[PDB]
Amino acid sequence: SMSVKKPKRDDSKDLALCSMILTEMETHEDAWPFLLPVNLKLVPGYKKVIKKPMDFSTIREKLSSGQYPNLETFALDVRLVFDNCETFNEDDSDIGRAGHNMRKYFEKKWTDTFK
């Protein structure tokens, strides 16, 4: 509260480490459904159904331009990618499986790096 603060957790490497994780996600063989924004002109249903589209390129641009205030808002956008994928794609499709695999991959890197 006022003039009463928990000890300062060192956040000075967070930007570098989120960039490393994101590089790892970009280079995973199963990243291909997630590298670019879904083409809203060419994919029926996507625009109406997926209220907040997100992809790795859009997270990379946000990251590079100071649009994440802290490491939790970065994790929220990464999970949004996978949550959108589950909303739109059957679990037993190539894209559906890709998204489960990538979520698992991310959550392990996240835990190992920060927790």
PDB file of C-alpha atoms in Angstrom, residues 26-78:
ATOM      1  CA  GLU A  26       9.012 -18.833 -34.576  1.00  0.00           C
ATOM      2  CA  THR A  27      11.524 -21.551 -35.533  1.00  0.00           C
ATOM      3  CA  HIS A  28       9.514 -24.583 -34.301  1.00  0.00           C
ATOM      4  CA  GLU A  29       8.443 -26.804 -37.223  1.00  0.00           C
ATOM      5  CA  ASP A  30       4.813 -26.666 -36.112  1.00  0.00           C
ATOM      6  CA  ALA A  31       4.693 -22.806 -36.048  1.00  0.00           C
ATOM      7  CA  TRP A  32       3.493 -22.505 -39.676  1.00  0.00           C
ATOM      8  CA  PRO A  33      -0.206 -21.895 -38.866  1.00  0.00           C
ATOM      9  CA  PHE A  34       0.786 -19.042 -36.528  1.00  0.00           C
ATOM     10  CA  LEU A  35       3.529 -17.099 -38.304  1.00  0.00           C
ATOM     11  CA  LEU A  36       1.257 -14.530 -40.015  1.00  0.00           C
ATOM     12  CA  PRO A  37      -2.200 -13.126 -39.460  1.00  0.00           C
ATOM     13  CA  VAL A  38      -5.083 -15.266 -40.754  1.00  0.00           C
ATOM     14  CA  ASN A  39      -6.233 -13.752 -44.073  1.00  0.00           C
ATOM     15  CA  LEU A  40      -9.692 -12.413 -43.103  1.00  0.00           C
ATOM     16  CA  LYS A  41     -10.691 -12.010 -46.774  1.00  0.00           C
ATOM     17  CA  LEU A  42      -9.901 -15.613 -47.643  1.00  0.00           C
ATOM     18  CA  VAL A  43     -11.008 -17.591 -44.566  1.00  0.00           C
ATOM     19  CA  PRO A  44     -14.759 -17.740 -44.113  1.00  0.00           C
ATOM     20  CA  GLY A  45     -15.990 -17.412 -40.587  1.00  0.00           C
ATOM     21  CA  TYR A  46     -12.727 -16.087 -39.107  1.00  0.00           C
ATOM     22  CA  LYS A  47     -13.526 -12.438 -38.900  1.00  0.00           C
ATOM     23  CA  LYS A  48     -16.879 -12.896 -37.154  1.00  0.00           C
ATOM     24  CA  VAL A  49     -15.976 -15.692 -34.885  1.00  0.00           C
ATOM     25  CA  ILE A  50     -12.446 -14.706 -33.651  1.00  0.00           C
ATOM     26  CA  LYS A  51     -12.900 -11.432 -31.869  1.00  0.00           C
ATOM     27  CA  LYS A  52      -9.197 -10.814 -31.185  1.00  0.00           C
ATOM     28  CA  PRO A  53      -6.951 -12.312 -33.859  1.00  0.00           C
ATOM     29  CA  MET A  54      -3.285 -12.774 -32.902  1.00  0.00           C
ATOM     30  CA  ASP A  55      -0.181 -14.313 -34.543  1.00  0.00           C
ATOM     31  CA  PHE A  56       3.578 -14.506 -33.963  1.00  0.00           C
ATOM     32  CA  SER A  57       4.447 -11.688 -36.397  1.00  0.00           C
ATOM     33  CA  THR A  58       2.077  -9.330 -34.645  1.00  0.00           C
ATOM     34  CA  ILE A  59       3.513 -10.282 -31.207  1.00  0.00           C
ATOM     35  CA  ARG A  60       7.067  -9.752 -32.629  1.00  0.00           C
ATOM     36  CA  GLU A  61       6.160  -6.262 -33.886  1.00  0.00           C
ATOM     37  CA  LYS A  62       4.460  -5.388 -30.524  1.00  0.00           C
ATOM     38  CA  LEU A  63       7.537  -6.685 -28.660  1.00  0.00           C
ATOM     39  CA  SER A  64       9.957  -4.700 -30.811  1.00  0.00           C
ATOM     40  CA  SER A  65       8.004  -1.395 -30.445  1.00  0.00           C
ATOM     41  CA  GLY A  66       7.373  -1.284 -26.610  1.00  0.00           C
ATOM     42  CA  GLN A  67       3.775  -2.275 -26.768  1.00  0.00           C
ATOM     43  CA  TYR A  68       4.013  -4.880 -23.928  1.00  0.00           C
ATOM     44  CA  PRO A  69       4.038  -3.180 -20.543  1.00  0.00           C
ATOM     45  CA  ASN A  70       5.195  -6.315 -18.768  1.00  0.00           C
ATOM     46  CA  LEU A  71       5.939 -10.038 -19.287  1.00  0.00           C
ATOM     47  CA  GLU A  72       2.284 -11.046 -18.399  1.00  0.00           C
ATOM     48  CA  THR A  73       0.738  -9.038 -21.216  1.00  0.00           C
ATOM     49  CA  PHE A  74       3.237 -10.850 -23.607  1.00  0.00           C
ATOM     50  CA  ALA A  75       2.095 -14.273 -22.242  1.00  0.00           C
ATOM     51  CA  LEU A  76      -1.583 -13.258 -22.645  1.00  0.00           C
ATOM     52  CA  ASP A  77      -1.027 -12.589 -26.429  1.00  0.00           C
ATOM     53  CA  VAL A  78       0.917 -15.861 -26.903  1.00  0.00           C
TER      54      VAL A  78
END
